[PDB]
Amino acid sequence: RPECFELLRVLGKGGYGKVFQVRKVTGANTGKIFAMKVLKAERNILEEVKHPFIVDLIYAFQTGGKLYLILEYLSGGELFMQLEREGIFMEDTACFYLAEISMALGHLHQKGIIYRDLKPENIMLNHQGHVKLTDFGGTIEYMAPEILMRSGHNRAVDWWSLGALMYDMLTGAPPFTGENRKKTIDKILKCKLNLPPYLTQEARDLLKKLLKRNAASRLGAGPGDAGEVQAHPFFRHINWEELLARKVEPPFKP
Hints:
With 254 residues, this protein is of the alpha+beta class. The protein has helices at 42-48, 79-86, 91-110, 145-148, 156-170, 181-189, 201-210, 226-231, 240-243; strands spanning 5-12, 18-24, 33-39, 57-62, 67-72, 77-78, 123-125, 131-133. It is 33% helix and 17% strand.
């Protein structure tokens, strides 16, 4: 119960409730560090998923209206401070972090869980420097059209979002924006895909195939899901067995 854990620091008033980084005192593991989400289902989901790129659930419970989740603490911080730091990622640097995520969305989906968001914010790194999907249910420049004007929904969305990430990985910012919640929205729904020149063919090919306005023909929408995507030759240097075994070295070690 909540009092087993001293509170070390607040992590985010983010979302419904709050999230504390905490340390444990009683019981088995003692003084290990943790993250404790406190909610006055996000749970349901974290409970089944057991996947090396999806944040682990350790304990759950409730009290006086308060439900407490206790997840592994993620020392890597947000992927997209690293972005903040190195401006834009090299095509490889990005193709790494992208594949991982990809096998994560892949799982999620066969378990009928679609992520909707996949901002560059709610993508956490761990001690090792790998990728861990985190916040389930803000900032729209990363979600599909077919949502913004409620349509809509299905695996598609997720993959659109995936472009935005990558695009925003290899280019300092998302594919659509501009100084306005309005015009930004508008600009998405009129999705005139402006590509850089300096992207290799493949990178561009993927994007044009991820960011397609019609979901149905968005690469990855097929019944083959993360199969199609992972298949595309942008990830041709990727050893998918090696990767899901965290035996591949991440280009940044926090």
